[PDB]
């Protein structure tokens, strides 16, 4: 069975992986045996889920260096500015589709909770600038050490800028040793490429072994309004990738049937693994050698990307918000219900591309429209429930919190004729 | 109002900053809006901060690997001990004139505590001989990524001298691999020395805003006995650079008046940030581009002395144990003002690089002459005053910190002529 | 004068350094001044520790990136494959002659205590599915950073394989980029050999100060039963050398006295260090300069073996694990001593390459035949003995630790036709 397994196509092994995995936990999970498939199915899933984390520090510096430096600051400014653009505006839309799919499917109208004016509770703010000032790091090595993307992009993107400036200086001899440091930063880029595409041969055991364990572990769970809830957000971001994403690609000519094939993995790791940056490594991936994006784009805008845009994230805010309200009894009137697009944007920026980290940030977002989560009181109620299927939640919103970062990108990059269109072509 | 900002000559406009931010700090601490410059004005320093901070790692491993493969280990090592004698004998010279100009203003004569015959503890045993073994750090990417400079000087001579070595090897293979890792080192720092410069351009805010603060905040405590105190501490400081230093740099054949016009970057730097170690980037850079030092020199002088030399803190350290012994009522007797000479030279050799931590270290000096910190008594209470005014103290206790590295440094490199004579005459 | 010392060759330096300074340390132990070594010796051991500490993670990552990128990944597993079968068989050996040594001095059966039938301690659960996931690091700066040797390794082969099938690539850039990576490797990795060199030269120093200090301290204290117990440690470490390594050294046509002669140096910092994980450079280097072995092979083997193969501590935990069962008056059944032979080979595998990690996994094995660590009973009583000589022993078997990592890599190496006969030829 190992000529068996790596000579079948990957394309469709990955999602036979996904498929089987998801129908062999949910076996398990009518039929008690969840335990097991934590014990010698899930580790499979924990390997596969390292072997990407290994790579995040390395390919996003490498990268970044590399494309920070293979395009004039002027033109990294122009695409910032488009990204972001870019970013808050399917982001908002995303909380826009959230809360008319909760309200069709009347999320929580069965839950039947009291409650009362809410108890009177002075807000933490909690506090931007200081979360801006961090995006500066005091000590790039710590920032590598630590984990810290967004710093570490801001590093990168200052290091590679400053390369170039040096390799059109006169000295012969700076020229020579800044594209010395040039070469090592790209033959580790390259060489952590090259290592993402052998772990993608295991994909199909993580990839499985990631969804058995969820489906065994959740799939119970989604039984009575929760099942709502669950149906609702699914619903939801189905949306934001068929019409916004569709819609916005069409526009920008790219053919939107085209993207979500070559997407696909990125999509299906992002599903199972439940963490954007996680999944990064494959993200990058797919845009150089399936979408066509030029190193010079997708190196700033996917690291970023996988933080601070979230619409996956975003609508799972505004689906369980309008839940919490309704199972207390005090439903979201009209105004309050456009504070929460204000809020739901910001607590998506700040979650982190980790699992669970939503379902934080979504406390923010309660306490925004007056829902305070004070035990036991009936809005902590409801925000448990929530809690209970969120990994079921999660494989959703990561999946299209990544997808909107691709479909930026290659949007993004179109529009800046960084776009290599020959893999676009049928035949 | 931003379009005059870059026209303006960026010759001088640093000092603008200065100056222009003293003012409006005194003016909005004295109407109670102190509060209004921490939370509007101060970000704009503490990112200047950051931006200079995230530089101090890179800039002084790639300097120092590169600096010391461009120099004999017999002269680095001669380099080394001329250096050291430079330093202790100045800070020797630093203590002398706090306790003459604490004496003169005779400080802490108002306060008129009164406490009785001191008490004995310790509590703890202090450790010398690890603080040196601590020197060998026992993982350099360990040491990188805590920030520490010290361990860092040792590896990164250590390398350099390796690599030089191993480039005059009999084999092609060996000298091209280690001028590859030469090169890289040499990239990186060519690097660094780039963006220190593009940051110093923003320098003017970030100073601005820092003194702004300060300012802000204890301009209204420079009343009392502490107005005595402030005038003291800087009086020496000005004497420390007037006397020792022009008269060490003349005897030397340095002009005294163009090495203060070249150093002011670095001087105005270490007294807003307050931090040897955050300024040794710019101070690196002056000792490059201003002075024309070699790395061979400035790359283990500077970043040794940044922890090492502290002038400033050594006299801050007799002024103000001067103050506090005559705060209580028992004045040093000379032999008492004598031990303090040698204990601050220790308490300054020992101070970190940082905001705040020779305050810190004076309790060490206070336990030398007899003064304990027990609480409440009233050496513990003088001591609290003394920490009140502490940042305005700071701000000319750094600046006279870096200072010396510099005249040193300068020093040092005339007497080895790895000093570039050309940058000194005007042409 | 400093100017007589650093001009005397290295050959026997280091041996008159172990050699006088294990003398020095004991006069001042029966003497009482075994504080004042602590105090104006130690320090001068210490620093030599700290020096050979600051190379592991530098010459780990580099030699290996660059090894690994020598070989073809299809070989390079037969090597895992040899090497880990070397180091299964002689861990398991190493118990052996444990149990053998150990029963043959009759240790701790003199020590005459209560126990009775202990009570039952069922945690800590051993754990490792988690134990192998955690050789995959999930950030690799921070596995630097933290000193996690099995990750690095695990990196480092991965970015070696994958720089090799780079460098063969068709663009020349993608050859030029790759090709440039692996020389900053190699100019790093050549580096830190030679400063192991220099380090070498103040061994002798270190040397003399870290066997001073242990042999002042603990010195004192074998008088006892436990006089008998470094007796059959000391004495089954010898055997595990002479018998064990030498019958399969001359197995496989390796000069065993040569193997012990090159080794010296790995061997001596060792035993003073009690670190085989600090003594790696100096194992790598004397695999390179000495025993002539490929960076494709040592830069592998030694920091894999540094951790998983230790056979003194697998004969160590075997000595011990008589002792408390014959000090409290239940001397071990056949069969719990087949149990050992598993659960001591795990243990060893599983200790960690720093001092006294022996001693800890020690409690590893005793709760395996059922002899359990409760305070203040009398099993509890005969571990806190063999604690309280545990440096004694712990050099002893640190050199046995590291001595069998080498002669796995030169009989591996010469398997894999690696070994460059020119430093073996009389
Ligand atoms: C227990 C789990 C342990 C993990 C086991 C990992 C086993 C990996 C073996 C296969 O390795 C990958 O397969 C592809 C060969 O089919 C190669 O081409 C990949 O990379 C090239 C990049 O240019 C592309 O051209 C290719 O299309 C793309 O498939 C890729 O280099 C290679 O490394
Ligand atoms: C959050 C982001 C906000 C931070 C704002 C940063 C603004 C950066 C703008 C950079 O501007 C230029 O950068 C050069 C730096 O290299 C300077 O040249 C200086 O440095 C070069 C070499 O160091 C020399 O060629 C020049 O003569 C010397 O003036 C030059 O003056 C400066 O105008
Ligand atoms: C109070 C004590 C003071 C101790 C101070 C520290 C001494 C540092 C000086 C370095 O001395 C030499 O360094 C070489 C390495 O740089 C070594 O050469 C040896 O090691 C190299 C690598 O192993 C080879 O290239 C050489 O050929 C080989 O002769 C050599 O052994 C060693 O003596
Ligand atoms: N797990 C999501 C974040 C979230 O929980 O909302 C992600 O990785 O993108
Ligand atoms: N500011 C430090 C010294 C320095 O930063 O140079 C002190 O407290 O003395
Ligand atoms: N200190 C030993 C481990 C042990 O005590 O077993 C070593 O490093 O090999
Ligand atoms: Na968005
Ligand atoms: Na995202
Ligand atoms: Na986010
Ligand atoms: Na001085
Ligand atoms: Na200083
Ligand atoms: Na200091
Ligand atoms: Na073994
Ligand atoms: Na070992
Ligand atoms: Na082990």
Same mark, same amino acid.
């Given at each position: 069975?190992?000529?068996?397994?790596?000579?079948?196509?990957?394309?469709?092994?990955?999602?036979?992986?996904?498929?089987?995995?998801?129908?062999?936990?949910?076996?398990?999970?009518?039929?008690?045996?969840?335990?097991?498939?934590?014990?010698?199915?899930?580790?499979?899933?924990?390997?596969?889920?390292?072997?990407?984390? =290994?790579?995040?520090?390395?390919?996003?510096?490498?990268?970044?260096?590399?494309?920070?430096?293979?395009?004039?600051?002027?033109? %990294?400014?122009?695409?910032?500015?488009?990204?972001?653009?870019?970013?808050?505006?399917?982001?908002?839309?995303?909380?826009?589709?959230?809360?008319?799919?909760?309200?069709?499917?009347?999320?929580?109208?069965?839950?039947?909770?009291?409650?009362?004016?809410?108890?009177?509770?002075?807000?933490?703010?909690?506090?931007?600038?200081?979360?801006?000032?961090?995006?500066?790091?005091?000590?790039?090595?710590?920032?590598?050490?630590? &984990?810290?993307?967004?710093?570490?992009?801001?590093?990168?993107?200052?290091?590679?800028?400053?390369?170039?400036?040096?390799?059109?200086?006169?000295?012969?001899?700076?020229?020579?040793?800044?594209?010395?440091?040039?070469?090592?930063?790209?033959?580790?880029?390259?060489?952590?490429?090259?290592?993402?595409?052998?772990?993608?041969?295991?994909?199909?055991?993580?990839?499985?072994?990631?969804?058995?364990?969820?489906?065994?572990?959740?799939?119970?769970?989604?039984?009575?309004?929760?099942?709502?809830?669950?149906?609702?957000?699914?619903?939801?971001?189905? %949306?934001?990738?068929?019409?916004?994403?569709?819609?916005?690609?069409?526009?920008?000519?790219?053919?939107?049937?085209?993207?979500?094939?070559?997407?696909?993995?990125?999509?299906?790791?992002?599903?199972?693994?439940?963490?954007?940056?996680?999944?990064?490594?494959?993200?990058?991936?797919?845009?150089?050698?399936?979408?066509?994006?030029?190193?010079?784009?997708?190196?700033?805008?996917?690291?970023?990307?996988?933080?601070?845009? =979230?619409?996956?994230?975003?609508?799972?805010? &505004?689906?369980?918000?309008?839940?919490?309200?309704?199972?207390?009894?005090?439903?979201?009137?009209?105004?309050?219900?456009?504070?929460?697009?204000?809020?739901?944007?910001?607590?998506?920026?700040?979650?982190?591309?980790?699992?669970?980290?939503?379902?934080?940030?979504?406390?923010?977002?309660?306490?925004?429209? &007056?829902?305070?989560?004070?035990?036991?009181?009936?809005?902590? %109620?409801?925000?448990?429930?929530?809690?209970?299927?969120?990994?079921?939640?999660?494989? &959703?919103?990561?999946?299209?919190?990544?997808?909107?970062?691709?479909?930026?990108?290659?949007?993004?990059?179109?529009?800046?004729?960084?776009?290599?269109?020959?893999?676009?072509?049928?035949?």
């Amino acid at each position: 069975l190992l000529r068996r397994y790596l000579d079948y196509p990957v394309l469709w092994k990955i999602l036979w992986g996904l498929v089987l995995g998801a129908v062999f936990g949910l076996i398990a999970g009518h039929f008690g045996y969840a335990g097991a498939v934590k014990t010698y199915i899930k580790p499979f899933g924990d390997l596969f889920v390292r072997l990407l984390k =290994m790579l995040v520090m390395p390919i996003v510096l490498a990268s970044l260096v590399v494309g920070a430096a293979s395009i004039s600051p002027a033109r %990294l400014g122009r695409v910032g500015v488009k990204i972001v653009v870019y970013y808050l505006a399917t982001s908002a839309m995303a909380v826009f589709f959230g809360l008319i799919v909760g309200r069709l499917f009347n999320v929580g109208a069965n839950v039947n909770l009291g409650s009362g004016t809410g108890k009177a509770i002075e807000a933490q703010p909690p506090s931007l600038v200081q979360t801006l000032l961090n995006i500066v790091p005091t000590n790039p090595f710590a920032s590598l050490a630590k &984990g810290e993307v967004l710093p570490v992009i801001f590093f990168a993107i200052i290091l590679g800028i400053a390369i170039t400036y040096l390799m059109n200086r006169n000295e012969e001899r700076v020229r020579k040793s800044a594209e010395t440091l040039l070469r090592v930063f790209d033959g580790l880029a390259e060489a952590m490429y090259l290592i993402v595409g052998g772990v993608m041969q295991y994909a199909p055991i993580g990839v499985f072994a990631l969804i058995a364990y969820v489906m065994a572990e959740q799939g119970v769970r989604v039984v009575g309004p929760l099942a709502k809830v669950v149906g609702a957000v699914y619903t939801g971001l189905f %949306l934001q990738i068929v019409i916004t994403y569709f819609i916005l690609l069409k526009v920008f000519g790219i053919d939107p049937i085209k993207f979500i094939r070559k997407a696909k993995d990125a999509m299906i790791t992002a599903f199972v693994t439940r963490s954007s940056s996680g999944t990064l490594p494959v993200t990058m991936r797919v845009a150089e050698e399936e979408m066509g994006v030029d190193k010079g784009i997708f190196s700033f805008t996917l690291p970023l990307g996988a933080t601070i845009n =979230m619409d996956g994230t975003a609508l799972y805010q &505004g689906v369980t918000v309008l839940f919490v309200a309704n199972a207390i009894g005090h439903p979201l009137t009209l105004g309050q219900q456009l504070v929460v697009v204000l809020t739901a944007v910001l607590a998506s920026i700040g979650t982190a591309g980790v699992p669970g980290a939503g379902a934080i940030m979504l406390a923010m977002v309660l306490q925004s429209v &007056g829902l305070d989560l004070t035990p036991g009181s009936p809005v902590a %109620l409801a925000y448990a429930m929530i809690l209970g299927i969120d990994a079921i939640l999660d494989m &959703g919103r990561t999946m299209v919190n990544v997808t909107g970062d691709l479909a930026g990108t290659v949007i993004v990059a179109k529009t800046e004729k960084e776009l290599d269109e020959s893999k676009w072509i049928s035949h």
